[PDB]
Every structure is written in structure tokens, then in C-alpha cells.
């Protein structure tokens, strides 16, 4: 997270880190069993690190457990980056206390101008690279659609929205893959891509979760 601030420790229950060896992408509790993240974020060998604020420390209200399987969307496009979503299975459900918590799916798209909490373990530094130890935190908008197309032409399809600030130094960037963005209580999107990090009229953009209510649903329940 580049221009976020420190959330503190557990106030993003929901949040998850998928580990194998080393943090690499973000992800969602969508419920005791199931996490949310994105298609790009798929790899062999995945640990679901839940309870984390310290990645590097074991602090207590930690759980790690293996992914028994990950979905990776039939119809992802690794070039556009379409359809970018990905669901995990845990091997054993998760104890769900305080600082572990599923986040809800949207029963409707938001609309631009809602504020969401975007968070994860990426990358820090607009030139550069900086990885943090605890969980960042970013407030950002959903921009409209013209402005998101304005600003990647013939790039963005309906299953994508831009959420950020055009003047930049604030966005999400590599590591917070998968992450979540959560708009009202409800997770809306998912960190997919964007040009660079926090760069002037290139916001990030992101998996409008949505669109994949019916899918995720359907999905779970026939596994
Ligand atoms: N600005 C953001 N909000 C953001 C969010 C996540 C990751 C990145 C870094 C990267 N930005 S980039 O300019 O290097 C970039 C942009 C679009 C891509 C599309 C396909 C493949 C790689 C791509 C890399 C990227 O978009 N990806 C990381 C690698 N895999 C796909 C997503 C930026
Ligand atoms: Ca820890």
C-alpha cells in the first residue's frame, strides 16, 4: 500500500495472506472455509495465514492452514487480466473469533463515489521497493467509469472497476494482489493491476466482485 497508514493490529479480521515461504498475495475470508482472492495469485504450495498484523512475527491470534484446492476462474485471461478472481478452499475451517471474521459479498454494485478500505503487505514505495511488516491500510473511492476508461483506454472491461486518486501517491501495488476493497461492509473488489504504483492518472484497478456472486455461490456449494 503506497500513501496508506498503519490499520492496526486485527481491525481487518477478514484480511488473509497467502504464504509459501514468503508473503505473496492477499485474500478474503469469505466464510470459515472459503477465501476470496485473485486469479493471478494462483501457485502451488499455498498456506492461508489468518489473524496476521506482523507477518514476520508470531504474535499469537495467528492460524495457518493449507489450501486444499484453488479455483482459479475457467474464463481468466492472464493478459487482460479478466475475469482476475480465484477462490480457496482451507483444508479445515477456521476458528472465527474477533480477529479472525468473514467478510460479506455484495448483493448489489456500488456506485462511484463510495469510499472503501483497501488493505495489504505489498509494496510501499512509488519508486522503489518496500515491503512492511504489519497490515496498511488505504481509504480510497470508486471512481466513475468514463474516468476509469479515460484513463486505460480499450483496457478496462465491465468486470473491472477503478478505485484510487488520479493525482496519485496514494493506491494499492505489488503484494496487495488479491487483497481485499471493501465498500460498506460489503467486499466489492479485489486487487487485480494498475500501471506502476500511485502514479499520476493511473488509478488501480480492480475485480468487481459483483459480478461473481452467482458464480462464487454456485461454486462453493458444489465443492
Ligand atoms: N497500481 C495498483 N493498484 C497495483 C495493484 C497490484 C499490482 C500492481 C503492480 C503491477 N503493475 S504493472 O504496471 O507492472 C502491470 C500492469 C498491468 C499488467 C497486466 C498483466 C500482466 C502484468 C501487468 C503489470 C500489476 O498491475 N500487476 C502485478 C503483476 N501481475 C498483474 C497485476 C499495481
Ligand atoms: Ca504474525
Redesign the pocket.
Known amino acids: 500500500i503506497?500513501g496508506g497508514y498503519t490499520c492496526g493490529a486485527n481491525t481487518v479480521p477478514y484480511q488473509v495472506s497467502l504464504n509459501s515461504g514468503y508473503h505473496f498475495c492477499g485474500g478474503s475470508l469469505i466464510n470459515s472455509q472459503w477465501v476470496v482472492s485473485?486469479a493471478?495469485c494462483y501457485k502451488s504450495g499455498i498456506q492461508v495465514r489468518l489473524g496476521e498484523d506482523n507477518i514476520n512475527v508470531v504474535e499469537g491470534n495467528e492460524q495457518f492452514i493449507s489450501a486444499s484446492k484453488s479455483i482459479v476462474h475457467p474464463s481468466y485471461n492472464?493478459?487482460?487480466?479478466n475475469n482476475?478472481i480465484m477462490l480457496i478452499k482451507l483444508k479445515s475451517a477456521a476458528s472465527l473469533n474477533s480477529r479472525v471474521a468473514s467478510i460479506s459479498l455484495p448483493t448489489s454494485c456500488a456506485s462511484a463515489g463510495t469510499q472503501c478500505l483497501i488493505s495489504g503487505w505489498?509494496?510501499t514505495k512509488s519508486s522503489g521497493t518496500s515491503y512492511p511488516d504489519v497490515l496498511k491500510c488505504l481509504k480510497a473511492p470508486i471512481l466513475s467509469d468514463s474516468s476509469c476508461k479515460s484513463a486505460y483506454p480499450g483496457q478496462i472491461t465491465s468486470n473491472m472497476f477503478c478505485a484510487?486518486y488520479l493525482e496519485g501517491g496514494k493506491?494499492?501495488?505489488?503484494?496487495?494482489?488479491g487483497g481485499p476493497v471493501v465498500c460498506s461492509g460489503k467486499l466489492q473488489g479485489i486487487?487485480?493491476?494498475?500501471?506502476?504504483?500511485?502514479?499520476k492518472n493511473?488509478?488501480?484497478?480492480?475485480t468487481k466482485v459483483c459480478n461473481y456472486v452467482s458464480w462464487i455461490k454456485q461454486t462453493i456449494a458444489s465443492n
Not at 493506491?171 to 494482489?177: A, I, L, M, N, P
Not at 486487487?191 to 502514479?199: E, F, L, N, R
Not at 493511473?202 to 480492480?206: A, C, M, T, W
Request: proline share 3%; glycine share 18%; hydrophobic share 20%.
Open positions: 503506497v485473485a493471478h492472464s493478459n487482460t487480466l482476475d505489498g509494496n484510487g493506491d494499492s501495488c505489488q503484494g496487495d494482489s486487487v487485480s493491476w494498475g500501471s506502476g504504483c500511485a502514479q493511473k488509478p488501480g484497478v480492480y
